[PDB]
Enzyme design. Structure first.
Site, short mmCIF file in Angstrom:
data_model
loop_
_atom_site.label_atom_id
_atom_site.label_comp_id
_atom_site.label_asym_id
_atom_site.label_seq_id
_atom_site.Cartn_x
_atom_site.Cartn_y
_atom_site.Cartn_z
N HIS A 72 35.25 26.39 24.41
CA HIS A 72 33.90 26.29 24.30
C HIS A 72 33.22 24.98 24.52
CE1 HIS A 72 33.10 30.57 23.11
NE2 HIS A 72 33.82 30.55 23.97
N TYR A 201 24.16 31.44 16.72
CA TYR A 201 23.89 31.27 15.39
C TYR A 201 22.50 31.56 15.57
CZ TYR A 201 28.21 28.85 14.44
OH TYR A 201 29.38 28.31 14.43
N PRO A 293 31.23 29.49 5.15
CA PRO A 293 31.56 29.61 6.63
C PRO A 293 30.65 29.44 7.83
CG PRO A 293 31.13 31.89 5.45
CD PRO A 293 31.26 30.96 4.50
N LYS A 297 34.25 25.50 9.10
CA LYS A 297 35.19 24.14 8.38
C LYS A 297 36.41 24.54 7.73
CE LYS A 297 33.32 21.31 10.80
NZ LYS A 297 33.75 21.17 12.16
N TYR A 385 30.12 19.11 14.50
CA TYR A 385 30.58 20.69 14.80
C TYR A 385 31.99 20.63 15.52
CZ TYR A 385 30.26 25.46 16.15
OH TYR A 385 30.57 26.88 16.29
C1 LIG Z 1 37.64 35.79 1.31
C2 LIG Z 1 37.74 34.90 2.52
C3 LIG Z 1 36.98 34.95 3.44
C4 LIG Z 1 36.94 33.91 4.59
N1 LIG Z 1 36.40 34.13 5.69
C5 LIG Z 1 35.88 33.21 6.56
C6 LIG Z 1 35.22 33.46 7.47
O1 LIG Z 1 34.57 34.75 7.63
N2 LIG Z 1 34.99 32.55 8.61
C7 LIG Z 1 35.76 31.41 8.28
O2 LIG Z 1 35.39 30.69 9.36
N3 LIG Z 1 36.28 31.26 7.29
C8 LIG Z 1 36.73 32.09 6.35
N4 LIG Z 1 37.57 31.77 5.34
C9 LIG Z 1 38.16 30.54 5.27
C10 LIG Z 1 39.24 30.77 5.88
O3 LIG Z 1 39.90 32.13 6.12
C11 LIG Z 1 40.25 29.85 4.93
O4 LIG Z 1 39.76 28.51 4.83
C12 LIG Z 1 41.74 29.79 5.36
O5 LIG Z 1 42.12 31.27 5.56
C13 LIG Z 1 42.59 29.25 4.32
O6 LIG Z 1 43.86 29.12 4.47
P1 LIG Z 1 44.77 28.86 3.20
O7 LIG Z 1 46.14 28.86 3.72
O8 LIG Z 1 44.38 27.48 2.40
O9 LIG Z 1 44.46 30.22 2.30
P2 LIG Z 1 44.72 31.70 2.60
O10 LIG Z 1 44.24 32.16 3.92
O11 LIG Z 1 44.11 32.21 1.35
O12 LIG Z 1 46.21 31.99 2.28
C14 LIG Z 1 46.68 31.64 0.99
C15 LIG Z 1 48.04 32.32 0.77
O13 LIG Z 1 48.10 32.33 -0.65
C16 LIG Z 1 49.07 33.60 -0.82
N5 LIG Z 1 49.13 33.80 -2.43
C17 LIG Z 1 48.00 33.62 -3.27
N6 LIG Z 1 48.24 33.53 -4.44
C18 LIG Z 1 49.75 33.53 -4.59
C19 LIG Z 1 50.45 33.28 -5.70
N7 LIG Z 1 50.16 33.00 -7.06
N8 LIG Z 1 51.76 33.16 -5.15
C20 LIG Z 1 52.14 33.36 -4.11
N9 LIG Z 1 51.42 33.54 -2.95
C21 LIG Z 1 50.18 33.72 -3.17
C22 LIG Z 1 48.19 34.42 -0.43
O14 LIG Z 1 48.43 35.90 -0.11
C23 LIG Z 1 47.72 33.99 0.94
O15 LIG Z 1 48.70 34.11 2.05
C24 LIG Z 1 37.62 32.94 4.53
C25 LIG Z 1 38.40 32.34 3.28
C26 LIG Z 1 38.30 33.27 2.13
C27 LIG Z 1 38.99 33.08 0.79
N1 LIG Z 2 30.67 29.82 11.72
C1 LIG Z 2 31.61 30.82 12.16
C2 LIG Z 2 32.03 30.80 13.64
C3 LIG Z 2 32.69 31.64 14.09
C4 LIG Z 2 33.45 32.69 13.05
C5 LIG Z 2 34.02 33.63 13.86
O1 LIG Z 2 34.65 34.52 13.01
O2 LIG Z 2 34.14 33.97 15.06
C6 LIG Z 2 33.16 32.80 11.84
O3 LIG Z 2 33.59 33.30 10.98
C7 LIG Z 2 32.18 31.67 11.37
#
Ligand SMILES: Cc1cc2nc3c(=O)[nH]c(=O)nc-3n(C[C@H](O)[C@H](O)[C@H](O)COP(=O)(O)OP(=O)(O)OC[C@H]3O[C@@H](n4cnc5c(N)ncnc54)[C@H](O)[C@@H]3O)c2cc1C
Ligand SMILES: Nc1ccc(C(=O)O)c(O)c1
Ligand SMILES: Cc1cc2nc3c(=O)[nH]c(=O)nc-3n(C[C@H](O)[C@H](O)[C@H](O)COP(=O)(O)OP(=O)(O)OC[C@H]3O[C@@H](n4cnc5c(N)ncnc54)[C@H](O)[C@@H]3O)c2cc1C
Ligand SMILES: Nc1ccc(C(=O)O)c(O)c1
EC number: 1.14.13.2
Lengths: 391, 391
Positions: A72, A201, A293, A297, A385
């Protein structure tokens, strides 16, 4: 069992770190509390900075991405009747962002790992970290009913917000910064064509609305809702009506609606822990910080954290420079704070806050008017961004 | 007595409007509650945008300014140890700002008027506005003990914040936006050489500090203080010690101190009234809006308001287009809101607020780090600082 780097959590942070390290010769073991399906059930993010797009190509897991991810070159902010487009490619000095689902990234990395034969213990219960300050720290977990022990040199806490890593560092060593927003996002995934080729947005008096896509036949939408709303109260019908009410009339009538594949309410929060390490434990991704979100980031900061951790461990193992690993937090926190500031701004100018007086309404409105109108203003949105450079 | 445009208040707004109109043939009468000395006793502002520098040259009152005003091409923001300079001339596309005391501007304009022979009634008591919606509105005032009457076509409310103009418009017609800051500035004027050739805006944990100048042998300084502080509690000694405590060590030791000529505590506030007119009454300067002094926008917005009022009255009188005078508020409010947003920002990133948690401290700090570090960020400060263009 012994290994060099024990990785807690199999989210994109862990899988990416584990994949990069494996490719460098550094053996790693991943411990995940859940099952692969549960992990793949998470929809989450969809926007990726160029920096992560390159880290994936580096992790050797990009075939599918090059094919299905969408490049994009602009976004659209819609406020008070108007719809203003931000040309990212020219305002950032040629950078763009890639749209590719988080679930896809996980799926790819997960395929890559299984084929590599590198160790992954799903369903690892009651993980505990020990001897974090010694030379030989270790991890204990239960597989079925047997408590096993894993010896390693370093532990990477990639277990997300509610993981065990952060709780393992003595409280008196970490300083916490946190902001909780009075609203959340009710997200929705649906097998319908998106309403726009670029994201939208939207700021509306009823609240924020977001129009995103996962592909040409799959859309992702979200609307700001109070923290008191339970998802089972929002029927699909209710969602689309609410969505249409918050968008520009010209967009609302192009909207192809349909039954939802996924729906969920994610609460908004800002969270930073300093520092991001303790002895031989290093925190990465959501285990250390959370950003609302609005700025997209989250996944991107996890990737940069991981990029830094991987590169500091290559030097330690490969070049014997384990001293560099002390620099970890300082390097990461610089990026982290810049991204937390941008995510906070985006959130405050696109969301409707409760109990706001007239002056702040006018300032929010003017913040938008000035930034989307100035050439210098648009650039600050664009460079942030597409994501600031990796240091 | 009759006239065309009755002007309430002899501050820089009134004197400037009265001077420009007089030069265009439009006869105006100025009514001032105080004496010329009292007006000249006010120190206030010192920074002028290029737009006002040109309006003065247009009002024909610039000889002295061209000679004594100082052209500046950069400012300095000092935070957390560092001192960062903003090159206004290159970041704005060649614009600069002029430092010239408000008291000087008033003095010049006041000299210009007296020589022109145009009418000015100082010591005009209990001014009242009447028939604001008729074709012949009028003003009544008392000179000694005689209530006189002044008939005019239009009235310009240039009487400042506590003037009678704004209170004359029926409350139910105006919508008010207001923000009061929990602090004020304790200003000080002294016959000593300034510590810098360019201004220095400093953020310090003890609060904001400002290093300004009026000339090469005269400095103007200010420090943020609580609203509970009474000026008689701050001896000169106390001021300099406090000032030195908030500045960079290298600056604090170059500081040439001395006895104060003037000292006073000005409270901070943001205030906007919409619209800025009623029938044949038009509000200008502080009569309509107040901005915190952090961005130096006060005097500058008064000048732009006046520039617009003058130009809309030339067309009405000269070209018979009195319809244009309805456009007044809309034209002015666009600038006004942009400047109120910039003044608000400057205030929030340079001042220490009471009861601020850790997250906001870090964001304030990062706001500074990002804006003074990005090329796009510095430009937003620069273009706003030198002042956005007149529409
Ligand atoms: C509820 C939620 C919703 C989100 N939604 C958005 C969104 O809508 N849009 C967006 O842009 N960003 C969103 N994010 C941010 C994005 O999805 C995260 O920044 C990204 O997933 C984080 O990656 P990670 O590997 O750090 O954590 P995670 O995806 O959380 O992965 C962490 C891993 O830890 C494992 N785990 C947890 N505790 C234990 C333990 N004690 N022992 C063993 N394994 C364990 C979990 O099962 C998971 O697999 C969201 C984050 C969260 C927490
Ligand atoms: N800020 C943003 C932009 C895109 C997405 C997406 O899921 O496509 C989001 O979760 C947050
Ligand atoms: C207390 C104060 C402190 C300020 N300090 C700073 C500062 O430190 N730095 C900075 O950059 N800006 C400062 N400013 C802003 C700047 O000085 C003003 O924006 C500028 O002076 C306003 O010009 P004006 O003509 O609109 O109002 P003013 O300078 O207020 O002039 C208004 C005129 O109205 C006359 N008047 C009032 N009521 C009546 C009446 N009913 N009838 C007749 N005559 C009347 C007054 O005596 C005065 O002459 C300050 C403003 C105020 C009010
Ligand atoms: N923000 C600013 C800049 C300069 C002056 C000044 O008096 O010199 C001021 O009062 C405020």
């Amino acid at each position: 069992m012994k290994t060099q780097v024990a990785i807690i959590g199999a989210g994109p942070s862990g899988l990416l770190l584990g994949q990069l390290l494996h490719k460098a010769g550094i053996d790693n073991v991943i411990l995940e509390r859940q099952t692969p399906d549960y992990v793949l059930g998470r929809i989450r993010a969809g926007v990726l900075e160029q920096g992560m797009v390159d880290l994936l190509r580096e992790a050797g897991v990009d075939r599918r991405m090059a094919r299905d991810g969408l490049v994009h070159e602009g976004v659209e902010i819609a406020f008070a009747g108007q719809r203003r487009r931000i040309d990212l490619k020219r305002l950032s000095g040629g950078k763009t962002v890639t749209v590719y689902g988080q679930t896809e990234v996980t799926r790819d990395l997960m395929e890559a790992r299984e084929a590599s034969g590198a160790t992954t213990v799903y369903q690892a219960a009651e993980v505990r970290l020990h001897d974090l300050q010694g030379e030989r720290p270790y991890v204990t977990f239960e597989r079925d009913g047997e408590r096993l022990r894993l010896d390693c040199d370093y532990i990477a806490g990639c277990d997300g917000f509610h993981g065990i890593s952060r709780q393992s560092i003595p409280a008196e060593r970490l300083k916490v910064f946190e902001r909780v927003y009075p609203f959340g996002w009710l997200g929705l995934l649906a097998d319908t064509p998106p309403v726009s080729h670029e994201l939208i947005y939207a700021n509306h008096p009823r609240g924020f609305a977001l129009c995103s896509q996962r592909s040409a036949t799959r859309s992702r939408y979200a609307v700001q809702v109070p923290l008191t709303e339970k998802v089972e109260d929002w029927s699909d019908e209710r969602f689309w009506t609410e969505l249409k009410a918050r968008l520009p009339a010209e967009v609302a009538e192009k909207l192809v609606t349909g039954p939802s594949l996924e729906k969920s309410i994610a609460p908004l929060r800002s969270f930073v822990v300093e520092p991001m390490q303790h002895g031989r434990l290093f925190l990465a991704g959501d285990a250390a910080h959370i950003v609302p979100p609005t700025g997209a980031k989250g996944l991107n900061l996890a990737a940069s954290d991981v990029s830094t951790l991987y590169r500091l461990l290559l030097k330690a193992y490969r070049e014997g420079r384990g001293e560099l690993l002390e620099r970890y937090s300082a390097i990461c926190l610089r990026r982290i704070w810049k991204a937390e500031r941008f995510s906070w701004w985006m959130t405050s100018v696109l969301h409707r806050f409760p109990d706001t007086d007239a002056f702040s309404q006018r300032i929010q409105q003017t913040e938008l008017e000035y930034y989307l109108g100035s050439e210098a203003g648009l650039a600050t949105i664009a460079e942030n961004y597409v994501g600031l450079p990796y240091e």
